[PDB]
């Protein structure tokens, strides 16, 4: 079992998780079984507590683990499905050591960061690397470990100290370190300034790790002079200095790393035994005709959602132009306070070829979602409602077709006489992979799902369609195995108007877009009726 | 005597010397006498040894000190003239302590960095601050000390350790620290990333200095959220967090700092007792008509030269478009190897309204300077030759008017039968402020110099017009006090064709452009004959 | 050429130079040619400027280099004779780079600590290691480099950074690092506290060197538990953790290191191709009868002097008890101010079996030296005067035999009518190895020097016997080659009363004591008249 530690230098956000995922897909293209671990240096046990503006888009695993979006990048670059504990955190590891101490497992010895926390990190990394997360049950050959944050943060110090030991616990042929840095090119200077990379490598070596690769996040490509200054002051070979510059599509980043020789490096360095990504890149860069989706949302918070639309767009062979609409601008109160916000949002929503109402929590902007769904019903615009979008598609059909004008969920208005979507916990949240049964053949969604009698999809919600009001409601084509819970709704006498109670986007891959996002893209270009035919 | 230490964070080149100079001109606008010290953490005693690609444009002081371009920024933002030792270096300070040790002045004690080098830095800073560098002999009230490099470099550590002591030697009301940092805004992220500023302030506090001001070099203005994150993690008041964003003209940087409240801060913080810069900025931003100068040079290396043209441009009320021409592209051999380089250079040189041949050293590109001067003579283009440009204007007039086709300097071709410019050392280099006498009234240069019988200008050259060949040569209107050395040449029967043996640009200020650069700008827009009239 | 860097941890003074010398004599016992370099992180060029209380006993090399006492430990543990530049300092290396910069050798580039000073250190270390300092002209196989100071001092950082590069310039088989630390055992705690060693190794690894050996300066031997805690937290093998505890004699320190396995370690670790020290130790520890020497001195400052007496003592097979007498206590003014100091000093001087007046500078205590020599003449006590002791033996014979009661040197009393020892510079100081000729056979000193017609000895003085007054003066048996300078004086009609103008102690080795120190030891036990017979 080989390990690659990806570490971040000057700043976060510089594509380190894309580099980690690209290194993984490169090694998978070498025929290796590859797993991945994200370390997030935060005290939070799971991302499920986060407001989607900080560590945006909590990605939901099969087991119900609410984790960082980087775990979703791993599942998209590599055909793996991960477990909760592939997201390591200081909360998870300190709680482990604390509970272990309270049980007496440390045998009356003083517990402390070195060794006991640094051992716990190594134990965890070894354990999770041996788990066959891959699409078939084969034991992984390499684990790409991404350390979040930046080096020399007080939060990252335990993990770097653990990896400093780890490279002597496993042999050097089993441990590589990549340092992903920034080389800024200021307006103030015109030069590509390597100084912060040099200081960050110096800092990392002060913590006892020496970069085997220095991967520079550049905007423009590195000059030779700057690369030789990096090689010099980072005390490493020129071949081991890489530029990841700005590129047109995500699909080029493995190819850029391939060109830069990292594959050949890893093969020799770790003693180890992608033409689709050329194709997808070249295909992307020659898309002329454009679809347009209105994303009517509250909240990067739509990372998986956007990616699922781009997969779908590339599959139908169109560009995508996503009309990001703040749902709080489609509310009639924004017509009072800011008529410029109100009319620009409705220009965007009307010019859109279809509309997507994504999931979320809280009242704020829900009435703007309900008005965006009303537009999409009555003007026959292709509609996808995801999680909350299904719940509010049942509220909108209740208000403006059934005439139950009071109707809402018990999340927002528990005082309502028509609680058409109700708090319905698992006898907790309906969270992770559940099986949905198709209750019929009469579904376009069933046809898009390949005419299977069931599907299994990742859920993350507390509320469901009320089974009393269901009798008056809007064909609930997908149900749970108990028949208790409605999980797909499809409206009769519309081109495509779907609510799904799960999150389709978490299972979208470039090679296989999720069928409701594909159906939305197909319908909003009029190709769905050809596809189903 | 008050001290302000300006320190650099993430990178160099982020306008720290402009910030230091702006802080100085702000305090001078408060009516204070202000001096400045640049510390360059390099082992070099003086910049006179540098190739102009590294620490480009060696600025020459009155005393003959060859120093960094930042000393020239101090002389341009503040009407001061500095001494050699206002450029402090590790070479100057270690050589001081070493020579002092060899003389036994440390009384048989072991000399070491702390205290003896850190004392020497403090001694130097106090001594040079008491020197009246200002336009009248009044003792300075504040010294702006700029520390070059970045904090936590092994070179900068002695100086930061010295300043850590200094703030307890002089009282806190006599010592302020400004930290000039970078807040990058990546294409990869869209966010303004404060992390490297936080780490740099943390690093600086590890070296025992706490930022009184954190000045963020931004591209775009700081968001409130980012400023509050800086104030938090740098543990300082929001009012003490400043953004210096990108602005149109240099003239706005004091005004931006003024708006950001730093003047009011310094006045209270140091217990101390610019409308022209509004004017110059607004004047600059509304210039419509453009002059164009061909800068036919070898080598930022033309920093003072460019600034002198921009002063002149703003004074005549035109824009400037500088046609940077690599002199090595005007050589006929570049017509052989790269005819695209050769013709683009001659398009630039012919479309130019006048030509400037700046100073320099070595053969490389001199034949391209000689061909650019030949163009400027015979096509009656306004010409300024500076230092080497005068020497080569005497070579060109010798080759193509006198027919001495062999002619060159003894620097390039010592074997020549017509050594028309010869190695003529000071009985060393002719370096620093010398007095030139005007040998006549018949000079446009004398009229531009206000009809004075002499001028005093900063020289930096080893070679001079041969007094033998002078008799055959091209009116040498300016001579030294000995009559040994020709120091201005002016050609008869041309609009404006001047060689000066000194560097006029080192004495250019926004409020007073140097007369040959002004005369070139005036002549290349046809206004000179009105100005002299 | 192999390198061993010895580095110091918690404090200086913890026997690091004895460890370095012991490692050298171990490798020399393996049949290797071994050289040594001391790095002193101080700004001083040479130790010749020091007051003997700081870096006490300036050791004088053949070339006239005045260096630290550790260079003398190298010459005593290994039969080598060193050059000036085997003492490296920051003064020597910064002056090198500065002078090299002023000559333009750095080609207009910015000189800075990394690379240019760190390169200069590596250049120096390589150059001085190739010099055959050994007793025959064979090129060294290993250089033991001792870094003075402690790790993580701002002074030591350039050298550790140089060695961090050096281990990748030469291969790992050519570079070993030993870390000599302290393990304190407080009265407050009873435990041996490894924490400062762990922190010092952590600090050293932050500077990029990892201990190949951790040598603990212990008082008492390490416990197993403490050694295993060191091995753990210093992340190194138990076999690579060594205790150098307190031992009876210096002769045991190589044997202790041998027992601890370091020889076997170095042989494998550096891929390389002492029974006298058992003997000398066992011989020392069974010495019963004692000689006693009065050391009547001003000033560790007598390190070489003490060692030369101990060599002599071990050779005659007696113990030595050195009566350290502050010469300022034998002055009659101390009878006025402190009669307890005055009488204790004269009890010590009278109970002594012989007296040694060592070299020194300045008036202070010279009248106490003159009174100690007066005692030794007239009471027929065996006397050795070294350098200043010869000069003052000519002053004392002038005052109290010739009756020139005014007599002194021109150093102390230039106004004197009998300047019997005069300032006589080299047409500078008479410094380093000079040849002395014996002007006769009638000398006990010539017999002790093996009946050679000349000797060559290390001098360090500015003053000499006046050749005018010489005619009235006390047989000057040793002269320089010019006959200008008297260099041995021997008094007729006394058991043994010798002045030497050189320093015999710098050439004393355990296997060969210097003959005047041996003659003093022999005479003060009455064995000299048997030895010469
Ligand atoms: C949104 C879109 C269209 C895309 O091309 N985005 C894009 C483009 C360029 C970069 C980029 C540019 N330079 C440097 C770096 C880095 F490497 F340094 F970070 N990145 C990042 N993201 C897309 C479709 S599918 C997807 N992502 S995905 O579903 O995970 C799939 C891969 C498995 N994104
Ligand atoms: C060349 C030109 C026309 C100029 O406007 N340049 C320019 C413009 C903007 C900035 C700038 C933008 N944002 C931020 C910062 C910083 F503060 F963060 F660095 N700077 C820097 N330089 C000029 C004329 S005169 C001169 N300079 S000068 O002769 O010394 C005189 C002042 C005394 N330059
Ligand atoms: C003065 C005397 C009698 C002596 O035994 N001293 C003594 C004794 C023990 C230690 C000692 C105890 N524990 C630990 C460590 C260390 F290793 F950790 F430092 N040292 C140090 N010095 C002596 C004679 S000859 C000489 N020295 S010498 O001429 O250079 C010759 C060797 C070539 N000294
Ligand atoms: O203002 C000054 C004065 C002196 N120096 C000194 O000159 C050296 C120049 O070094 P830089 O700071 O330019 O760093 P670099 O070349 O290693 O990296 P980038 O430019 O690519 O970011 C520094 O390390 C410092 O010792 C300055 O950088 N700037
Ligand atoms: O990938 C991950 C995982 C975890 N974390 C953790 O979350 C914290 C988020 O902090 P950031 O790294 O975003 O830093 P910041 O907000 O102080 O500064 P800028 O964004 O303006 O540059 C970090 O300090 C680290 O502890 C990440 O940053 N990224
Ligand atoms: O007062 C306290 C409280 C807590 N601790 C904690 O317990 C740990 C005990 O560790 P020590 O400080 O005893 O260090 P050590 O055993 O590594 O080394 P020596 O004793 O040989 O010097 C420390 O590292 C700290 O985390 C104390 O040491 N002391
Ligand atoms: N995942 C979501 O979109 C949440 C929807 C809704 N708030 C619920 O809890 O069911
Ligand atoms: N300052 C310059 O332009 C130098 C010109 C020429 N090389 C000289 O030494 O005179
Ligand atoms: N080495 C010494 O003892 C110095 C003796 C005397 N001061 C001289 O200079 O000669
Ligand atoms: Mg640089
Ligand atoms: Mg952040
Ligand atoms: Mg302990």
Swiss-Prot record, chains A, B, C:
Q: Which SUPFAM superfamilies did the record assign?
A: Class I glutamine amidotransferase-like, P-loop containing nucleoside triphosphate hydrolases
UniProt modified residues of type N6-acetyllysine: 100
Q: What EC number(s) would the UniProt record show?
A: 6.3.4.2
Which CDD domains did the record assign? Answer: CTPS_N, GATase1_CTP_Synthase
Induction (UniProt): Up-regulated in T-cells and B-cells activated through the TCR and the BCR respectively (at protein level).
Query: What tissues express this gene product?
Result: Widely expressed.
Record's Pfam families?
CTP_synth_N, GATase
* The entry's keywords: Acetylation, ATP-binding, Cytoplasm, Glutamine amidotransferase, Immunity, Ligase, Nucleotide-binding, Phosphoprotein, Pyrimidine biosynthesis
State what changing residue 161 to K does.
Localizes to cystolic filament structures
**Catalytic function, reaction form:** UTP + L-glutamine + ATP + H2O = CTP + L-glutamate + ADP + phosphate + 2 H(+)
BP GO terms, sorted: 'de novo' CTP biosynthetic process; B cell proliferation; CTP biosynthetic process; nucleobase-containing compound metabolic process; pyrimidine nucleobase biosynthetic process; response to xenobiotic stimulus; T cell proliferation
Q: Please give the pathway this protein is involved in.
A: Pyrimidine metabolism; CTP biosynthesis via de novo pathway; CTP from UDP: step 2/2
In the UniProt record, the signal sequence range is none
Chief location of this protein within or outside the cell? cytoplasm
What are the disulphide bonds in this sequence?
none
| Catalytic-site annotation from UniProt | 387 (for gatase activity), 503 (for gatase activity), 505 (for gatase activity)
Q: Where is the protein localized?
A: Cytoplasm, Cytosol
**Domain annotation Glutamine amidotransferase type-1: ranges:** 292-531
So which disease is it linked with? Immunodeficiency 24: A life-threatening immunodeficiency, characterized by an impaired capacity of activated T and B cells to proliferate in response to antigen receptor-mediated activation. Patients have early onset of severe chronic viral infections, mostly caused by herpes viruses, including EBV and varicella zooster virus (VZV), and also suffer from recurrent encapsulated bacterial infections, a spectrum of infections typical of a combined deficiency of adaptive immunity.
Query: What does this gene product do?
Result: This enzyme is involved in the de novo synthesis of CTP, a precursor of DNA, RNA and phospholipids. Catalyzes the ATP-dependent amination of UTP to CTP with either L-glutamine or ammonia as a source of nitrogen. This enzyme and its product, CTP, play a crucial role in the proliferation of activated lymphocytes and therefore in immunity.
Which family does the record assign? Belongs to the CTP synthase family.
What is this protein's name?
Answer: CTP synthase 1
Organism whose genome encodes this protein: Homo sapiens (Human)
């Amino acid at each position: 079992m080989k390990y690659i530690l990806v570490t971040g230098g000057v700043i976060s956000g510089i594509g380190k998780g894309i580099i980690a995922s690209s290194v993984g897909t490169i090694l998978k293209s070498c025929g290796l079984h590859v797993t991945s671990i994200k370390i997030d240096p935060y005290i939070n046990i799971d991302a499920g507590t986060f407001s989607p503006y900080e560590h945006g888009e909590v990605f939901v695993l099969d087991d119900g683990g609410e984790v960082d979006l980087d775990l979703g990048n791993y599942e998209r670059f590599l055909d793996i499905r991960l477990t909760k504990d592939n997201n390591l955190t200081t909360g998870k590891i300190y709680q482990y050591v604390i509970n272990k101490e309270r049980k007496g497992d440390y045998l009356g010895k003083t517990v402390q960061v070195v060794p006991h926390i640094t051992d716990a990190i190594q134990e965890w990394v070894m354990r999770q690397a041996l788990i066959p997360v891959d699409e078939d049950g084969l034991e992984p050959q390499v684990c790409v470990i991404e350390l979040g944050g930046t080096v020399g943060d007080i939060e990252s110090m335990p993990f770097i100290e653990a990896f400093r030991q780890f490279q002597f616990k496993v042999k050097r042929e089993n441990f590589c370190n990549i340092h992903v840095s920034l080389v800024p090119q200021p307006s103030s200077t015109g030069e590509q300034k390597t100084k912060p990379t040099q200081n960050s490598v110096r800092e990392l070596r002060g913590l006892g790790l020496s970069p085997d690769l220095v991967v520079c996040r550049c905007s423009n490509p590195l000059d030779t002079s700057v690369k030789e200054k990096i090689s010099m002051f980072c005390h490493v070979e020129p071949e081991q200095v890489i530029c990841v510059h700005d590129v047109s599509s995500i699909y080029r980043v493995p190819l850029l790393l391939e060109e830069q020789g990292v594959v050949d490096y890893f093969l020799r360095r770790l003693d180890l035994p992608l033409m689709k990504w050329k194709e997808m890149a070249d295909r992307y860069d020659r898309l002329l005709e454009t679809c347009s989706i209105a994303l009517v949302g509250k909240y990067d918070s739509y990372a998986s959602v956007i990616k699922a639309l781009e997969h779908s767009a590339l599959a139908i062979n169109h560009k995508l132009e996503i009309k990001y609409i703040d749902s709080a601008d489609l509310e009639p109160i924004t017509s009072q306070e800011e008529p410029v916000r109100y009319h620009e949002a409705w220009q965007k929503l009307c010019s859109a070829h279809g509309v997507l109402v994504p999931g979320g929590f809280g009242v704020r902007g829900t009435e703007g979602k309900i008005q965006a769904i009303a537009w999409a019903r009555n003007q026959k615009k292709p509609f996808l409602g995801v999680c909350l979008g299904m719940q509010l598609a049942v509220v909108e059909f209740s208000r403006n077709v059934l005439g139950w004008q009071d109707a809402n969920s018990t999340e927002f208005d528990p005082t309502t006489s028509h609680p058409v979507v109700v708090d319905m916990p698992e006898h907790t949240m309906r969270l992770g992979k559940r099986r949905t049964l198709f209750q019929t053949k009469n579904s376009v969604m069933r046809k898009l799902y390949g005419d299977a009698d069931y599907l299994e999809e990742r859920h993350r919600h507390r509320f469901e369609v009320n089974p009393v009001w269901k009798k008056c409601l809007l064909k609930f084509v997908g149900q749970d195995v108990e028949g208790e819970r409605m999980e797909i709704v499809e409206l009769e006498d519309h081109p495509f108007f779907v609510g799904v109670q799960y999150h389709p986007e978490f299972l979208s891959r470039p090679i296989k877009p999720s069928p409701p996002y594909f159906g939305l893209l197909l319908a909003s270009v009029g190709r769905l009726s050809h596809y189903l035919q």
